[PDB]
Amino acid sequence: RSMEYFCAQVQQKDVGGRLQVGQELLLYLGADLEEDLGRLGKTVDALTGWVGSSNYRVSLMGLEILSAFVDRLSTRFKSYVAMVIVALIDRMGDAKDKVRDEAQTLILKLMDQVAPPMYIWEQLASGFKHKNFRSREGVCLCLIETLNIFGAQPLVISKLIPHLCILFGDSNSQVRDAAILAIVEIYRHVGEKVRMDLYKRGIPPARLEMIFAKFDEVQS
């Protein structure tokens, strides 16, 4: 079976058959894919739709298939990053823990295998303002993981800080706390110049004092 075949199958109106279609595609990926670039794009497009699904089995299966496409395409997946990242930001807001986790894992995989971490972050940073509080928390958690896996050298820290500053004021404690963890982890990697930066961000004084208390407690 071929790409023409899978392109048609993943676009079926009958969603009920997505798991069966997906399993076949997964086996196929594991085993031309790139003989028609248009068809490859339409297939990835459709699977990005599957990631959207409220059925966790389908969203997970879409994530697995996209992950397999990343394994086989590497930097040739770059053209799909924009739309995949939008879907991933939404998915990080999913009610189901495993789904949120697999969404985050794929985002990190893009930074490892498809394009430099900052290229991904230029798109991913849009998620900081998403109107799902779980998505907002997830973007912060991605930043922490990015530092844990790739370090701070690949990123332009000054473009990420202002987003965290907004999230210090979030309506949810879990989002504020994740943003705080993220800024403190930036501090761990970059050092005292992060304090210098944070004085120029318009942060209210009592909040800034609180952030610097967290910095003082960085290893205590």
Residue numbers in the entry: 5 to 35, 41 to 229
Give the original sentences from the paper that presented this experimental model.
Cytoplasmic linker-associated proteins (CLASPs) are excellent candidates to promote MT growth because they are well known to increase MT abundance and stability in mitosis and interphase. CLASP1α and 2α consist of three TOG-like domains (termed TOG1, 2, and 3) and a C-terminal domain responsible for interactions with CLIP-170 and other partners, CLIP-interacting domain (CLIP-ID) (Akhmanova et al., 2001, Al-Bassam and Chang, 2011). Mammalian CLASPs encompass three TOG-like domains, TOG1, TOG2, and TOG3, none of which bind to free tubulin. CLASPs suppress catastrophes by stabilizing growing microtubule ends, including incomplete ones, preventing their depolymerization and promoting their recovery into complete tubes.
To understand why TOG1 does not bind to free tubulin, we solved its structure by X-ray crystallography. The structure of TOG1 showed a conserved TOG-domain fold, but also demonstrated that the conserved residues required for tubulin interaction are lacking. This explains why TOG1 does not bind to either free tubulin or MTs. We also checked whether TOG1 could bind to alternative tubulin structures, such as tubulin rings induced by dolastatin or vinblastine, but found this not to be the case. We confirmed that the binding of TOG2 and TOG3 to stabilized MTs was weak, while TOG1 and CLIP-ID did not bind to MTs at all, and none of these domains interacted with free tubulin. Strikingly, the deletion of this domain (which converted CLASP2α to the equivalent of the naturally occurring splice isoform CLASP2γ), strongly diminished the ability of CLASP2 to suppress catastrophes, in agreement with a previous publication (Yu et al., 2016). To explain these results, we hypothesized that CLIP-ID has an auto-inhibitory activity that can be relieved by TOG1. Addition of this construct potently increased the anti-catastrophe activity of all TOG2-containing CLASP2 constructs that lacked TOG1 but contained CLIP-ID. These results suggest that CLIP-ID, when it is not bound to partners such as CLIP-170, has an inhibitory effect on TOG2, and possibly also on TOG3, while TOG1 can relieve this inhibition. Thus, in contrast to a previous publication suggesting that the ability of TOG1 to bind free tubulin is required for CLASP activity (Yu et al., 2016), we establish that TOG1 has an autoregulatory function. TOG1 is present in CLASP1/2α but absent in CLASP2β and CLASP2γ isoforms (Akhmanova et al., 2001).
